[PDB]
Amino acid sequence: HMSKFTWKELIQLGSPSKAYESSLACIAHIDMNAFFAQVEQMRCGLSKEDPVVCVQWNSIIAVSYAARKYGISRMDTIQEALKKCSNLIPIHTAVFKKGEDFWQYHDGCGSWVQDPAKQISVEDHKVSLEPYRRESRKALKIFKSACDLVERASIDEVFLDLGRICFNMLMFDNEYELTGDLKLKDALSNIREAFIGGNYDINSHLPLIPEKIKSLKFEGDVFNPEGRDLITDWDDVILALGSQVCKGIRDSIKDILGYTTSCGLSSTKNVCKLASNYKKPDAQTIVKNDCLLDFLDCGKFEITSFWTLGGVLGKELIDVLDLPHENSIKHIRETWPDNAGQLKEFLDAKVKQSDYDRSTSNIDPLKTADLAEKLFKLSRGRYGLPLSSRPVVKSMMSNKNLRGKSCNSIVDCISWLEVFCAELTSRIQDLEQEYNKIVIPRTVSISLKTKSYEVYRKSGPVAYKGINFQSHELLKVGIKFVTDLDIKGKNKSYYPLTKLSMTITNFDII
Ligand SMILES: [Mg+2]
Ligand SMILES: [Mg+2]
Numbered sequence: 383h384m385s386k387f388t389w390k391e392l393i394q395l396g397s398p399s400k401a402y403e404s405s406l407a408c409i410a411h412i413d414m415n416a417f418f419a420q421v422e423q424m425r426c427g428l429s430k431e432d433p434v435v436c437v438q439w440n441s442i443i444a445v446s447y448a449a450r451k452y453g454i455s456r457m458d459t460i461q462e463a464l465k466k467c468s469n470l471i472p473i474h475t476a477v478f479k480k481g482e483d484f485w486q487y488h489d490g491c492g493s494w495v496q497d498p499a500k501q502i503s504v505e506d507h508k509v510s511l512e513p514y515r516r517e518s519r520k521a522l523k524i525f526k527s528a529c530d531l532v533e534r535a536s537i538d539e540v541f542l543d544l545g546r547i548c549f550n551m552l553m554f555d556n557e558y559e560l561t562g563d564l565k566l567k568d569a570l571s572n573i574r575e576a577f578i579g580g581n582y583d584i585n586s587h588l589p590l591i592p593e594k595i596k597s598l599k600f601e602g603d604v605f606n607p608e609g610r611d612l613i614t615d616w617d618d619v620i621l622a623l624g625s626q627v628c629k630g631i632r633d634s635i636k637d638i639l640g641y642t643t644s645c646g647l648s649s650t651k652n653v654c655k656l657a658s659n660y661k662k663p664d665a666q667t668i669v670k671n672d673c674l675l676d677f678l679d680c681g682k683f684e685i686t687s688f689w690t691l692g693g694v695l696g697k698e699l700i701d702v703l704d705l706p707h708e709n710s711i712k713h714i715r716e717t718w719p720d721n722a723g724q725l726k727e728f729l730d731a732k733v734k735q736s737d738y739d740r741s742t743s744n745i746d747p748l749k750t751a752d753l754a755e756k757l758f759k760l761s762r763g764r765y766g767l768p769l770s771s772r773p774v775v776k777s778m779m780s781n782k783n784l785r786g787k788s789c790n791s792i793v794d795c796i797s798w799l800e801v802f803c804a805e806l807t808s809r810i811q812d813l814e815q816e817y818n819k820i821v822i823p824r825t826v827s828i829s830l831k832t833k834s835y836e837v838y839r840k841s842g843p844v845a846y847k848g849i850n851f852q853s854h855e856l857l858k859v860g861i862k863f864v865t866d867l868d869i870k871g872k873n874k875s876y877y878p879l880t881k882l883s884m885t886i887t888n889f890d891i892i
Pocket of ligand 2: 481482483797800
């Protein structure tokens with residue numbers, strides 16, 4: 383007898399461009415839970431047990447899991463949370479002041495204190511997220527150094543493709559020890575000699591795993607409610623090694639930066655993202671291939687839980703496919719269990735019946751084959767998408783919603799453009815570090831809403847004389863445009879404005 387996998391699917395792990403396509407893939411999704419709260423926690427020399435909460439104005443934007451033990455969520459106001467926790471530590475985010483080109487933390491201030499001098503008025507202030515962008519960047523530098531392929535899914539989430547690391551570790555690591563008596567080089571000498579030997583057809587089946595390797599330990603919580611054998615094939619051997627490696631990367635994030643992370647480990651991104659949100663914080667959820675259906679049917683997940691099926695598209699599928707309200711995943715598998723063609727024939731008929739409503743439908747009748755395959759694999763937990771890089775920036779905006787008189791004249795507009803130009807510059811610096819190239823916006827757009835909520839807009843070029851000398855250039859143009867729009871206003875209902883925004887587009891990366 384022999385393994386269910388081939389050499390092709392194992393060698394593929396060494397290819398950064400196609401390792402994800404292999405059923406032996408080892409993907410990881412790492413999430414820094416309540417990231418903003420973790421950042422403020424560390425900044426104030428606090429511990430994970432101190433119940434910090436990141437406040438914006440009157441709302442909570444991040445809840446440390448110490449504060450969640452008191453039932454605090456993002457739906458509560460600070461006053462509601464104070465009544466839930468009397469030792470709460472609300473920390474307000476950094477903030478610009480109207481007319482200043484720098485942001486500043488006002489620790490000890492906020493709408494929850496009584497002293498009127500310790501207030502952070504919303505009327506003449508704008509939030510700054512630079513502290514979080516800067517800390518997130520530090521995490522990526524740690525990720526990108528331990529993994530040759532990293533996707534920044536968001537400011538607090540990343541995917542890793544541990545393919546190359548797992549493969550090289552499987553075939554060449556001579557230092558790893560299963561126990562005090564057994565090293566990897568000895569337990570896997572059979573497949574290593576077979577690989578160096580080269581006497582295999584790439585479509586030949588791998589040799590059976592040796593009994594020696596079942597001593598290999600998973601680092602983390604292996605999701606296994608049915609008590610299946612842990613190491614039953616090479617997919618589990620790869621996944622086990624990846625759990626060890628991934629624990630080290632997550633411990634680097636905590637030893638260098640102090641941030642905790644929940645993690646999901648499997649053979650596909652969709653499953654990895656579900657696993658990381660299954661147990662948190664400071665957790666690591668492993669989903670073997672032989673436990674994929676157990677995981678998708680554990681009760682937490684429905685068809686709408688997948689990355690792309692949460693919106694209108696998902697809800698239309700529930701009606702077209704006549705899915706139950708619970709266990710819709712299991713229903714998809716069993717209603718079309720043989721092949722995606724069955725589901726494609728079902729979709730083709732449905733869109734071809736009477737009362738199809740093809741004019742408003744979100745189901746493209748020409749790509750029913752691509753869709754049927756997507757659902758067929760997601761429901762079986764084998765829909766592997768590649769780790770894509772963050773698309774290059776096309777547009778940035780900084781705006782402020784103005785309630786009251788905080789923008790009654792031209793001078794008040796310029797004061798806000800000074801804030802907008804500083805945030806856009808900060809956000810361009812963070813990009814120049816990610817792209818490792820210079821970033822130059824070539825056109826600027828100002829738009830504003832009058833007291834009657836009518837819109838005035840004007841765009842144009844920004845003449846960077848030298849190179850990357852923004853935050854003065856584009857404030858010139860910003861002030862020129864807001865002046866023109868004043869003259870267009872003139873004897874019209876204009877001030878006090880209700881909204882003001884600056885948008886930069888047409889970037890040149892060099
Ligand atoms: Mg998240
Ligand atoms: Mg000023």
